[PDB]
Amino acid sequence: RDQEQYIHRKCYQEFAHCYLVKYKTPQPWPNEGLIADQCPLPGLADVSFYPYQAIWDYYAKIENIRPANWTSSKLYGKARMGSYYIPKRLRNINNTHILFCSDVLYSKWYNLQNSILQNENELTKRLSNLTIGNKLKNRALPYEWAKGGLNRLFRNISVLDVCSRPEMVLLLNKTYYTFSLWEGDCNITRYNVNETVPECKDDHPYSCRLWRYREGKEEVKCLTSDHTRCLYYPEYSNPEALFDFGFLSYMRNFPGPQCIESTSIRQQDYEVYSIYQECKLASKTYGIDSVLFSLKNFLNYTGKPVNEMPNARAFVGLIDPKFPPTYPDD
Ligand SMILES: *[C@@H]1O[C@H](CO)[C@@H](O[C@@H]2O[C@H](CO)[C@@H](O[C@@H]3O[C@H](CO[C@H]4O[C@H](CO[C@H]5O[C@H](CO)[C@@H](O)[C@H](O)[C@@H]5O[C@H]5O[C@H](CO)[C@@H](O)[C@H](O)[C@@H]5O)[C@@H](O)[C@H](O[C@H]5O[C@H](CO)[C@@H](O)[C@H](O)[C@@H]5O)[C@@H]4O)[C@@H](O)[C@H](O[C@H]4O[C@H](CO)[C@@H](O)[C@H](O)[C@@H]4O[C@H]4O[C@H](CO)[C@@H](O)[C@H](O)[C@@H]4O[C@H]4O[C@H](CO)[C@@H](O)[C@H](O)[C@@H]4O)[C@@H]3O)[C@H](O)[C@H]2NC(C)=O)[C@H](O)[C@H]1NC(C)=O
Ligand SMILES: *[C@@H]1O[C@H](CO)[C@@H](O[C@@H]2O[C@H](CO)[C@@H](O[C@@H]3O[C@H](CO)[C@@H](O)[C@H](O)[C@@H]3O)[C@H](O)[C@H]2NC(C)=O)[C@H](O)[C@H]1NC(C)=O
Ligand SMILES: *[C@@H]1O[C@H](CO)[C@@H](O[C@@H]2O[C@H](CO)[C@@H](O[C@@H]3O[C@H](CO)[C@@H](O)[C@H](O)[C@@H]3O)[C@H](O)[C@H]2NC(C)=O)[C@H](O)[C@H]1NC(C)=O
Ligand SMILES: *[C@@H]1O[C@H](CO)[C@@H](O[C@@H]2O[C@H](CO)[C@@H](O[C@@H]3O[C@H](CO)[C@@H](O)[C@H](O)[C@@H]3O)[C@H](O)[C@H]2NC(C)=O)[C@H](O)[C@H]1NC(C)=O
Ligand SMILES: *[C@@H]1O[C@H](CO)[C@@H](O[C@@H]2O[C@H](CO)[C@@H](O)[C@H](O)[C@H]2NC(C)=O)[C@H](O)[C@H]1NC(C)=O
Ligand SMILES: *[C@@H]1O[C@H](CO)[C@@H](O)[C@H](O)[C@H]1NC(C)=O
């Protein structure tokens, strides 16, 4: 009978937006610190005027009370306080692949105003028209991922993505771009702002000023004998007062300084395989049930199922996975 529809339905409901990205070589995120001023911060006492930003999971939050001989490096490595600390598990040299199940990276053909029927149909059509086996043609990808890219399935990643999808950016960005209003970045100080920024000849109170000024060396001062409760002094100024300065500056709400520097993270072409296309292909040989079982287990490669992870966060690193998985000969 026309088995095709059952295989489509099952493969789609389990693996539609699941993909496997192979780095040319294992190259992890290179710094412990992430400078992303474009994301709003929680602000004073966390009474936040913005919805929860996922990147806040990695926020190096300044605390006023610290023990007597406390340094930021004890908790956040080389990261700046008030920026973000990338934990070791998100910059792991051993990780050769990135597995994700998310629709946030589809280009404009996919848009949630349409009926789900349209989007389902269009995605399966495009995948069939864009795959050699289970491997995507380079034209499906961003050119930044693979030479020949024409965004025919995936969009380019953006500056604001890191705020809602930090793991995706950390694991998949070919290049790290800073967005900074910190004093000293790009040799911009509180003294030469009227000279480095063209449009400043000296209105929003945020105009032509920096966000974080360097106040001095980081230190802990103890004014009691109680050395467990001492006062912390950050190196740069505290951003709670001006919690959305960087975001508002990124939206070009006012003129002023902006520092953007690039760092090449991963070189050479990505390869990308569609788990859905592999489901549909292997089903005609080994049967839908075993293909389903084996690819579900592959999605559980780390003990946490990637497709049971939130759509914005379902991006995981893998160490030398066998793909396709062995299919049971039953
Ligand atoms: C994960 O990966 C993601 C994907 O890889 C990644 O997303 C990408 O991030 C990067 C970095 O953020 C993005 O690239 C940036 O794009 C910026 C914006 O580009 C547009 O706007 C600028 C400015 O536009 C002004 O001028 C035009 C005319 O020129 C006007 O039409 C505008 O209206 C505007 O005019 C004024 O008005 C605005 C308010 O309305 C003001 O805000 C504005 O500042 C003006 O005052 C244009 O220049 C751009 O033109 C480009 O157009 C296309 C591409 O769009 C190209 O074909 C073309 O060649 C132009 O590049 C565009 O329209 C850019 O500003 C930004 O450029 C800076 O960074 C790069 C990389 O380092 C530099 O090479 C570049 O020269 C710029 O660096 C200078 O400026 C920065 C600060 O901006 C300094 O820190 C730096 O030191 C340097 O200064 C030196 O040079 C200056 C000359 O520029 C000089 O003046 C200085 O004095 C100094 O000597 C950069 O290109 C990219 O778009 C993202 N991609 C996507 C798909 O989103 C993501 O970030 C990654 N995430 C993480 C976490 O890593
Ligand atoms: C990249 O992979 C290597 C190899 O898997 C990782 O090194 C290994 O790290 C584990 C802990 O994550 C070590 O296991 C421990 O070994 C001690 C013996 O000293 C044992 O008593 C513990 O119960 C535990 O099993 C393992 O020794 C270590 N192996 C080597 C060769 O270094 C490495 O950490 C990975 N890198 C990253 C950044 O994750
Ligand atoms: C996603 O990112 C890529 C960059 O890797 C963008 O590709 C670039 O797109 C621009 C405009 O579409 C191309 O420039 C144009 O070239 C033609 C040549 O005929 C010229 O007539 C135009 O005036 C303009 O200069 C550029 O070549 C192209 N670069 C590459 C490497 O393909 C792409 O547009 C981005 N898409 C989105 C939606 O952000
Ligand atoms: C993805 O793989 C992980 C294995 O890394 C699976 O976790 C396993 O989940 C089962 C279900 O509860 C656990 O079995 C039970 O464990 C308890 C306590 O250890 C034991 O007393 C019971 O007799 C029973 O065997 C199992 O321990 C656990 N394994 C680990 C290492 O945590 C997970 O279920 C898999 N997810 C999917 C969707 O398949
Ligand atoms: C999708 O399939 C079409 C087949 O129609 C591929 O090529 C298109 O061919 C028609 C003529 O039949 C041209 O008019 C189109 O311009 C072609 N498409 C493009 C995008 O140029 C197409 O390459 C396949 N891939 C995608 C991503 O659509
Ligand atoms: C900042 O100054 C240093 C030298 O002190 C120089 O190497 C660097 O390129 C400068 N950066 C910018 C953005 O001007």
Numbering used by the authors: 218 to 419, 427 to 554
Copy the relevant paper text.
Recombinant RBDs from several simian FV (SFV) strains were tested for production in Drosophila S2 insect cells, and only the RBD from gorilla SFV (strain SFVggo_huBAK7422, genotype II; abbreviated as ‘GII’ herein) was expressed in high enough yields and formed crystals. Crystals were obtained for the RBDD, as well as for the untreated protein (RBDG). The RBDD diffracted better (2.57 Å) than RBDG (2.80 Å) and the structural analyses presented below were carried out using the RBDD structure, unless otherwise noted. The NAG and MAN units built only into the RBDG (and not RBDD) structure are indicated with red frames. A prominent feature of the upper subdomain is the eighth N-linked sugar (N8)18 attached to the α4 helix residue N390. The N390 side chain and the first two attached NAG residues are buried in the RBD, rendering the EndoH/D cleavage site inaccessible, which allowed building 10 sugar residues in RBDG and 8 in the deglycosylated protein crystals. The N8 glycan emerges from a cavity that has N390 at its base and extends upwards, remaining in contact with the protein and preserving the same conformation in both crystal forms. Structural analyses revealed that the glycan establishes extensive van der Waal contacts with the residues underneath (buried surface area of 803 Å2) and forms hydrogen bonds with main-chain atoms from Y394 and I484 and the side chain of E361. N8 is the only N-glycosylation site in SU that is strictly conserved across the FV subfamily, and the hydrophobic patch residues laying beneath it are conserved as well.
The FV envelope (Env) glycoprotein belongs to a class I fusogens, which are synthesized as single-chain precursors that fold into trimers, and whose protomers are subsequently cleaved in the Golgi compartment during transport to the cell surface. FV Env is cleaved at two sites by cellular furin during maturation, giving rise to 3 fragments: the leader peptide (LP), the surface (SU) subunit, which includes the receptor-binding domain (RBD), and the transmembrane subunit (TM), which harbors the fusion machinery. In this manuscript we present the X-ray structure of the RBD from a zoonotic gorilla FV at 2.57 Å resolution, which reveals a novel fold. We identified, within the RBD, two subdomains in terms of their structure, conservation, and function: the upper subdomain, which encompasses most of the genotype-specific region, and a more conserved, lower subdomain, important for binding to the attachment factor HS.
